[PDB]
A paper describes a structure:
Calcineurin (CN) is a Ca2+/calmodulin (CaM)-dependent, serine, threonine-specific protein phosphatase that controls T-cell activation and is critical for numerous cellular functions. The CN complex is composed of a catalytic (CnA) and regulatory (CnB) subunit that binds Ca2+, and is activated by Ca2+–CaM2. Here we report the crystal structures of fungal CN ternary complexes with [name]-[name] from highly clinically relevant human fungal pathogens: A. fumigatus, C. albicans, [name], and Coccidioides immitis, reflecting the common invasive fungal pathogens, including a mold, yeasts, and a dimorphic endemic fungus. Each complex has three components: (1) the CnA subunit with catalytic domain and the BBH, (2) the CnB subunit, with four EF hands bound to Ca2+ and wrapping around the BBH, and (3) [name] bound to [name], interfacing with CnA/CnB.
Crystal structures of CN–[name]-[name] ternary complexes from four fungi were determined by molecular replacement to resolutions between 1.85 and 3.30 Å. Despite sequence variations between the mammalian and fungal counterparts of CN and [name], the X-ray characterized ternary complexes reveal high structural homology. A flexible hinge in CnA separates the catalytic domain from the BBH, which forms the composite surface for [name]-[name]-complex binding. Fungal CnB structures are also conserved, with two well-resolved C-terminal EF-hands close to the [name]-[name] binding surface and the two distal N-terminal EF-hands showing varying degrees of disorder, suggesting interaction with [name]-[name] may stabilize the C-terminal EF-hands. The interface between CN and [name]-[name] complexes is conserved across fungi, but differences are notable in the binding surfaces of [name] and CnA in fungi versus mammalian proteins. While the CnA and CnB interacting residues within 5–8 Å of [name] in human and fungi are conserved, fungal FKBP12s differed in 4 of the 17 interacting residues, as well as other residues surrounding the 40s and 80s loops.
Residue numbers in the entry:
A (entry chain C): 2 to 112
B (entry chain A): 25 to 31, 37 to 401
C (entry chain B): 2 to 175
The structure:
């Protein structure tokens, strides 16, 4: 449902698991490349508890495929993003999202 | 009556973060808007701060700025003949607060001659401010400030991106349709100091002589193909100067329309039209500008790219640039971004942004109660 | 029982539920009330799994407590759930959302109220300066009488685009 494309290598040792607190910078683009949101817009990385339903299914299954420090391309089908409803003002229905993420921190271990 | 105080304490009865300025709540009056020196033009000094504080105009005020600027642009021909010295600027893309540092780096419009290559809207969430400001500037300095048309000064891309949403949000669709009809009056090219062709995009297989730019009917929307499209959309080939093809033009599979032009294509145009270089924008440069290969006849770079949007899209972390050109010396100055107020994606108000998460989590608990 | 009969027929007229449904709500109501005190305490609520790690737990309990006694009796338990009935009206669902941001229950949403409620849900993912700015613009666009506060009518004339009925409904429940 979600594909992980590697940009930059990680350490290949510290990978998130269910329950870990990750800190991720990202930039979200539609299939046409037009951006819809980015943590770098706000100059502050995004934090969440991965693998507990707190974020979309594309993240809850793709972040475990990362390692600390790795840059990646989370490409989520609508069934793993916002679906046939989409986000009312931002994400159109049936949209395939691309999150270019960078795993800056897992729990408290900095990269 | 309930009064809540949260623990150094703070109550709900006042603004929590005070160091951040509040927006301009009140539309300007007739004394604020109209200049005291000329009663037919806005006050640049007031507008600059009013827009800086995220202020807004009356619908009548915005329309007057777009229609009085449009009358000036319409009288100007398609191909401008501007004179040195001059400051040539690249894309600004709705980044109003960087446009403020641009004018400090390039010069005060009263003492300086400007040439923008278009792309004043979209991407940035302050696009109507850049337009209403520069259009007001055109009213004060119509002989010294010249504005050109980019591929975004149309109905096609503004509807596809963020500018049509912004006008609908900060003003009305009447302003938007007024903004689009005003864009159709923008000149398409410029010949600076009888040496450099100044456009937004690039060349075209239908662009042979400058007389072909003079024959364009610029009072329409950019077409799907042809001269008027490629002028605003064409890019230099990736391996420009180092090309592995003897072709003069190739299809632009990156933009989805128009063409790539090659070094041999640029040189032929400069040699036939007795020009020194091509000054354009379009492509964001990490260093704010980019010099392309030098011509075999004059040694001057065949193409120059100028980008004036620093920290493009708030993610690129690139530099901007302006072309301070005199005949003796060519100085390219670079500047860095400036903090701007925050907007939620697509001008979302707070409640549209937060209710889905509230509607989900409140529902999560109610379901958990019904299954004890 | 004449005592319980008065509270039953009363709730059958105000709530969007029916008699048979109110019996099932009384069942789960007593299933949480572990100390049999006739009400639910905040520690009794947070004793549930999904409720504990929920950023809107304290908001939900506060809205259920219509009188403000720190406890949710059955009359309040039924009142809070009625808004989420599939047979419930549109205006009922909007009022529950309004009460999420109206902490002092004074009928208006203020700059401080909005900032505090959001920061609790948002966290550090937004800078404090960024949340204050987007709160400033949201109020001035929604305010139409210049009071600097947001009434329920100004809140409805702003979330008209949002479909709250889909957000605030259970349907299969009860
Ligand atoms: C103020 C309180 C709200 C609270 C807002 C924040 C903490 C700020 C946070 C940076 C969100 C951004 O705010 C600028 C903005 O980020 C996006 O642009 C975006 O890049 C995105 O897709 N992200 C954000 C990064 C993690 C993945 C994904 C997400 O999982 O987002 C999650 C999401 C929306 C889940 C929905 C919930 C509703 C369900 O119905 C739906 O189920 C299909 C899934 C977010 C993190 C929620 O858990 C928490 C919130 O919503 C969304 C396009 C819209 C979203 O604004 C909401
Ligand atoms: Ca109890
Ligand atoms: Ca009570
Ligand atoms: Ca209040
Ligand atoms: Ca009000
Ligand atoms: Fe551009
Ligand atoms: Zn462009």
């Amino acid at each position: 449902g979600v594909t992980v494309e590697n940009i930059k290598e990680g350490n290949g040792v510290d990978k998130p698991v269910k329950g870990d607190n990750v800190t991720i910078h990202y930039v979200g683009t539609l299939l046409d490349g037009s951006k819809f949101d980015s943590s770098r817009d706000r100059g502050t990385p995004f934090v969440c508890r991965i693998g507990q339903g707190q974020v979309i299914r594309g993240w809850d299954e793709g972040v475990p495929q990362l390692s600390l420090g790795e840059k990646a391309n989370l490409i989520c089908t609508p069934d793993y993003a916002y679906g046939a409803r989409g986000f009312p003002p931002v994400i159109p229905p049936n949209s395939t999202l691309k999150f270019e993420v960078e795993l800056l921190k897992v729990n408290s271990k900095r990269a | 009556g309930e009064n809540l105080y949260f623990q150094e304490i703070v109550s709900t009865t006042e603004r929590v973060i005070k160091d951040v300025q509040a927006p301009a709540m009140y539309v300007p009056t007739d004394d604020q808007f109209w200049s005291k020196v000329d009663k037919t033009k806005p006050d640049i000094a007031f507008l600059k701060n009013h827009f800086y504080r995220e202020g807004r105009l009356t619908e009548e005020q915005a329309l007057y700025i777009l229609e009085k600027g449009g009358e000036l642009l319409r009288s100007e021909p398609n191909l401008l003949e501007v004179d040195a010295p001059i400051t040539v600027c690249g894309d600004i893309h709705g980044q109003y607060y960087d446009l403020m540092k641009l004018f400090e780096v390039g010069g005060n419009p009263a003492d300086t001659r400007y040439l923008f290559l278009g792309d004043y809207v979209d991407r940035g969430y302050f696009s109507i401010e850049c337009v209403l400001y520069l259009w007001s500037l055109k009213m004060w300095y119509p002989d010294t400030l010249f504005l050109l048309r980019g591929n975004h000064e149309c109905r096609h891309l503004t509807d596809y991106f963020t500018f049509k949403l912004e006008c609908k949000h900060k003003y009305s669709e009447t302003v938007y349709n007024a903004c689009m009809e005003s864009f159709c009056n923008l000149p398409l090219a410029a010949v600076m100091n009888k040496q450099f062709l100044c456009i937004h995009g690039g060349l075209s297989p239908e662009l042979h002589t400058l007389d072909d730019l003079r024959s364009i009917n610029r009072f329409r929307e950019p077409p799907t193909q042809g001269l008027m499209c490629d002028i605003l959309w064409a890019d230099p080939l990736e391996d420009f100067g180092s090309e592995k093809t003897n072709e003069n033009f190739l299809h632009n599979h990156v933009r989805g329309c128009s063409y790539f032009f090659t070094y041999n294509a640029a040189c032929q145009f400069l040699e036939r039209n007795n020009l020194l270089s091509i000054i354009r924008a379009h492509e964001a440069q990490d260093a704010g500008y980019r010099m392309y290969r030098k011509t075999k006849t004059t040694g001057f770079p065949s193409v120059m790219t100028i980008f004036s949007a620093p920290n493009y899209l708030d993610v690129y972390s690139n530099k901007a640039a302006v072309l301070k050109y005199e005949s003796n010396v060519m100085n390219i100055r670079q500047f860095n971004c400036t903090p701007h107020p925050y907007w939620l994606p697509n001008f979302m108000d707070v409640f549209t942004w937060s209710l889905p998460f509230v509607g989900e989590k409140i529902t999560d608990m109610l379901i958990a109660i019904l299954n004890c | 029982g004449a005592a319980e009969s008065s509270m039953f027929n009363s709730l059958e007229k105000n709530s969007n539920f029916s008699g048979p449904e109110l019996m099932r709500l009384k069942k789960r109501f007593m299933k949480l009330d572990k100390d049999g005190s006739g009400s639910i305490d905040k520690d009794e609520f947070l004793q549930i799994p999904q409720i504990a790690n929920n950023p809107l737990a304290h908001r939900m309990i506060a809205i259920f407590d219509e009188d403000g006694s720190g406890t949710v009796d059955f009359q309040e338990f039924v009142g809070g759930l009625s808004a989420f009935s599939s047979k419930g009206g549109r205006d009922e669902k909007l009022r529950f959302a309004f009460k999420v941001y109206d902490m002092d229950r004074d009928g208006y949403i203020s700059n401080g109220e909005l900032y505090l409620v959001l920061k609790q849900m948002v966290g550090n993912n937004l800078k404090d300066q960024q949340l204050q700015q987007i709160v400033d613009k949201t109020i001035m666009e929604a305010d139409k009488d210049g009071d600097g506060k947001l009434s329920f009518e100004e809140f409805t004339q702003m979330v008209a685009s949002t479909d709250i009925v889909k957000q605030m409904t259970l349907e299969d429940l009860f």
